[PDB]
Scaffold this active site. Structure first.
Site, PDB file in Angstrom:
ATOM      1  N   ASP A  85      -3.347  17.109  66.021  1.00  0.00           N
ATOM      2  CA  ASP A  85      -3.543  18.052  64.919  1.00  0.00           C
ATOM      3  C   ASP A  85      -2.826  17.570  63.643  1.00  0.00           C
ATOM      4  O   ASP A  85      -2.409  18.387  62.809  1.00  0.00           O
ATOM      5  CB  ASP A  85      -3.075  19.457  65.340  1.00  0.00           C
ATOM      6  CG  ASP A  85      -3.578  20.548  64.420  1.00  0.00           C
ATOM      7  OD1 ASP A  85      -4.663  20.341  63.804  1.00  0.00           O
ATOM      8  OD2 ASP A  85      -2.904  21.621  64.313  1.00  0.00           O
ATOM      9  N   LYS A 140      -6.208  13.415  60.001  1.00  0.00           N
ATOM     10  CA  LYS A 140      -7.373  13.197  60.878  1.00  0.00           C
ATOM     11  C   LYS A 140      -7.738  11.721  61.066  1.00  0.00           C
ATOM     12  O   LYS A 140      -8.340  11.356  62.084  1.00  0.00           O
ATOM     13  CB  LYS A 140      -8.585  14.030  60.435  1.00  0.00           C
ATOM     14  CG  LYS A 140      -8.326  15.554  60.259  1.00  0.00           C
ATOM     15  CD  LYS A 140      -7.483  16.180  61.379  1.00  0.00           C
ATOM     16  CE  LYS A 140      -6.763  17.447  60.901  1.00  0.00           C
ATOM     17  NZ  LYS A 140      -5.758  17.936  61.912  1.00  0.00           N
ATOM     18  N   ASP A 158      -7.898  19.290  67.218  1.00  0.00           N
ATOM     19  CA  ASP A 158      -8.356  20.309  66.276  1.00  0.00           C
ATOM     20  C   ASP A 158      -9.110  19.626  65.133  1.00  0.00           C
ATOM     21  O   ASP A 158      -8.928  18.430  64.911  1.00  0.00           O
ATOM     22  CB  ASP A 158      -7.141  21.077  65.727  1.00  0.00           C
ATOM     23  CG  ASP A 158      -7.535  22.321  64.932  1.00  0.00           C
ATOM     24  OD1 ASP A 158      -8.597  22.909  65.212  1.00  0.00           O
ATOM     25  OD2 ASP A 158      -6.787  22.708  64.013  1.00  0.00           O
ATOM     26  N   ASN A 159      -9.949  20.373  64.418  1.00  0.00           N
ATOM     27  CA  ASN A 159     -10.533  19.909  63.136  1.00  0.00           C
ATOM     28  C   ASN A 159     -11.474  18.708  63.238  1.00  0.00           C
ATOM     29  O   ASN A 159     -11.519  17.874  62.318  1.00  0.00           O
ATOM     30  CB  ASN A 159      -9.434  19.534  62.127  1.00  0.00           C
ATOM     31  CG  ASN A 159      -8.415  20.624  61.919  1.00  0.00           C
ATOM     32  OD1 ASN A 159      -7.263  20.465  62.299  1.00  0.00           O
ATOM     33  ND2 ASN A 159      -8.821  21.727  61.295  1.00  0.00           N
ATOM     34  N   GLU A 218      -9.435  27.608  60.307  1.00  0.00           N
ATOM     35  CA  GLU A 218      -8.460  28.713  60.255  1.00  0.00           C
ATOM     36  C   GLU A 218      -8.626  29.578  59.002  1.00  0.00           C
ATOM     37  O   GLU A 218      -8.714  29.044  57.891  1.00  0.00           O
ATOM     38  CB  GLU A 218      -7.010  28.218  60.348  1.00  0.00           C
ATOM     39  CG  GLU A 218      -6.626  27.054  59.407  1.00  0.00           C
ATOM     40  CD  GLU A 218      -6.891  25.688  60.033  1.00  0.00           C
ATOM     41  OE1 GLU A 218      -7.835  25.533  60.848  1.00  0.00           O
ATOM     42  OE2 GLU A 218      -6.142  24.761  59.717  1.00  0.00           O
TER      43      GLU A 218
HETATM   44  C1  LIG Z   1      -2.317  20.768  60.574  1.00  0.00           C
HETATM   45  S1  LIG Z   1      -0.640  20.357  60.124  1.00  0.00           S
HETATM   46  C2  LIG Z   1      -0.016  20.753  61.775  1.00  0.00           C
HETATM   47  C3  LIG Z   1      -0.361  22.196  62.143  1.00  0.00           C
HETATM   48  C4  LIG Z   1       0.184  22.654  63.492  1.00  0.00           C
HETATM   49  N1  LIG Z   1      -0.290  21.751  64.580  1.00  0.00           N
HETATM   50  C5  LIG Z   1      -0.183  24.122  63.733  1.00  0.00           C
HETATM   51  O1  LIG Z   1      -1.314  24.465  64.127  1.00  0.00           O
HETATM   52  O2  LIG Z   1       0.670  25.004  63.543  1.00  0.00           O
HETATM   53  C6  LIG Z   1      -0.593  18.550  60.086  1.00  0.00           C
HETATM   54  C7  LIG Z   1       0.854  18.065  60.151  1.00  0.00           C
HETATM   55  O3  LIG Z   1       0.907  16.748  60.661  1.00  0.00           O
HETATM   56  C8  LIG Z   1       1.902  16.024  59.982  1.00  0.00           C
HETATM   57  N2  LIG Z   1       1.551  14.599  60.111  1.00  0.00           N
HETATM   58  C9  LIG Z   1       0.600  13.903  59.390  1.00  0.00           C
HETATM   59  N3  LIG Z   1       0.579  12.636  59.849  1.00  0.00           N
HETATM   60  C10 LIG Z   1       1.499  12.515  60.841  1.00  0.00           C
HETATM   61  C11 LIG Z   1       1.873  11.458  61.645  1.00  0.00           C
HETATM   62  N4  LIG Z   1       1.292  10.273  61.491  1.00  0.00           N
HETATM   63  N5  LIG Z   1       2.846  11.636  62.610  1.00  0.00           N
HETATM   64  C12 LIG Z   1       3.452  12.867  62.772  1.00  0.00           C
HETATM   65  N6  LIG Z   1       3.050  13.923  61.979  1.00  0.00           N
HETATM   66  C13 LIG Z   1       2.103  13.749  61.029  1.00  0.00           C
HETATM   67  C14 LIG Z   1       1.888  16.593  58.561  1.00  0.00           C
HETATM   68  O4  LIG Z   1       3.158  16.448  57.964  1.00  0.00           O
HETATM   69  C15 LIG Z   1       1.591  18.058  58.816  1.00  0.00           C
HETATM   70  O5  LIG Z   1       2.799  18.753  59.035  1.00  0.00           O
HETATM   71  C1  LIG Z   2      -4.088  18.537  59.055  1.00  0.00           C
HETATM   72  N1  LIG Z   2      -4.980  19.673  58.815  1.00  0.00           N
HETATM   73  C2  LIG Z   2      -5.599  19.880  57.626  1.00  0.00           C
HETATM   74  C3  LIG Z   2      -5.414  18.912  56.485  1.00  0.00           C
HETATM   75  C4  LIG Z   2      -4.908  19.297  55.232  1.00  0.00           C
HETATM   76  C5  LIG Z   2      -4.786  18.313  54.231  1.00  0.00           C
HETATM   77  C6  LIG Z   2      -5.173  16.993  54.487  1.00  0.00           C
HETATM   78  C7  LIG Z   2      -5.676  16.592  55.726  1.00  0.00           C
HETATM   79  C8  LIG Z   2      -6.108  15.164  55.997  1.00  0.00           C
HETATM   80  C9  LIG Z   2      -5.319  14.056  55.644  1.00  0.00           C
HETATM   81  C10 LIG Z   2      -5.729  12.740  55.897  1.00  0.00           C
HETATM   82  C11 LIG Z   2      -6.972  12.502  56.503  1.00  0.00           C
HETATM   83  C12 LIG Z   2      -7.783  13.587  56.852  1.00  0.00           C
HETATM   84  C13 LIG Z   2      -7.341  14.893  56.596  1.00  0.00           C
HETATM   85  C14 LIG Z   2      -5.792  17.580  56.711  1.00  0.00           C
HETATM   86  N2  LIG Z   2      -6.409  20.938  57.412  1.00  0.00           N
HETATM   87  C15 LIG Z   2      -6.605  21.821  58.414  1.00  0.00           C
HETATM   88  C16 LIG Z   2      -5.996  21.651  59.652  1.00  0.00           C
HETATM   89  O1  LIG Z   2      -6.186  22.499  60.674  1.00  0.00           O
HETATM   90  C17 LIG Z   2      -5.168  20.541  59.855  1.00  0.00           C
HETATM   91  O2  LIG Z   2      -4.629  20.426  61.061  1.00  0.00           O
HETATM   92 MG   LIG Z   3      -5.528  21.736  62.644  1.00  0.00          MG
END
Ligand SMILES: C[S@@+](CC[C@H](N)C(=O)[O-])C[C@H]1O[C@@H](n2cnc3c(N)ncnc32)[C@H](O)[C@@H]1O
Ligand SMILES: Cn1c(-c2cccc(-c3ccccc3)c2)ncc(O)c1=O
Ligand SMILES: [Mg+2]
Length: 215
Positions: free
Chosen positions: A141, A144, A169-170, A199
């Protein structure tokens, strides 16, 4: 503080939720994000799919990629059995600090090992530093574009076994088509799609479950 959205989501929980009550914390986060500021928590609708996967497969060693404010860590940790472990990896140290506070507030502190750093860096340390043999389940999550290379890295690192469950997810919005082509196109996974919604929105989204069959 109230400075960042993340701090404001936490403040709202501190003001309205019952400590030690995981369901209370989740309702408070969802209410604030539905009503005031959209945030990328998996949320309650897709949360039920996450619940159902955990309740069917009953993982003891769970890994989460992307912790954010702790919403999904609390959601999953609350369903886990005594002695079960959730390792969650979070790249942004400010998100991590919120997650620990959220997990402590919700009463699931002992289920959770929060690790600060990039999943690509931390995954190959799991065996050496975190007492992991193989994983029961992984919740993907994070960003992506990391789904595919992190799945490939998990396999290569020896962390998947026959029956390891991946849940992503997503896979529709924002989407992970390369990850989907890989797991669906590979005989090493048995896949299931769960169509849902992004969401707090009416935009179509979905989750993918991919069960590792072994190498
Ligand atoms: C969708 S949010 C997580 C939401 C959480 N799983 C929830 O449903 O409550 C995506 C998160 O992944 C973190 N993230 C992005 N790339 C990452 C990586 N390569 N390793 C660890 N965390 C990462 C971002 O900082 C952000 O906090
Ligand atoms: C992480 N994420 C995001 C989110 C929010 C900002 C940027 C990106 C992101 C970054 C790099 C490549 C692809 C996507 C994703 N939106 C909804 C979710 O449920 C979620 O888990
Ligand atoms: Mg998500």
């Amino acid at each position: 503080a109230g400075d960042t959205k993340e701090q404001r989501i936490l403040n709202h929980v501190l003001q309205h939720a019952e400590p030690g009550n995981a369901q209370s914390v989740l309702e408070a986060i969802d209410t604030y994000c539905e009503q005031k500021e959209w945030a990328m928590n998996v949320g309650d609708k897709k949360g039920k799919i996450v619940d159902a996967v955990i309740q069917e497969h009953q993982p003891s060693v769970l890994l989460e990629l992307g912790a954010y404010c702790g919403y999904s860590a609390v959601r999953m940790a609350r369903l886990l059995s005594p002695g079960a472990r959730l390792i969650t990896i979070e790249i942004n140290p400010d998100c991590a600090a919120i997650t620990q506070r959220m997990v402590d507030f919700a009463g699931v502190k002992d289920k959770v090992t929060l690790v600060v750093g990039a999943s690509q860096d931390i995954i190959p340390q799991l065996k050496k530093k975190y007492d992991v043999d193989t994983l029961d389940m992984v919740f993907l999550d994070h960003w992506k574009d990391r789904y595919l290379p992190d799945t490939l890295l998990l396999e290569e690192c020896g962390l998947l076994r026959k029956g390891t469950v991946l849940l992503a997810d997503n896979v529709i919005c924002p989407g992970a088509p390369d990850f989907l082509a890989h797991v669906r196109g590979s005989s090493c996974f048995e896949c299931t799609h769960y169509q849902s919604f992004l969401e707090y929105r009416e935009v179509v989204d979905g989750l993918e479950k991919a069960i590792y069959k072994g190498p």
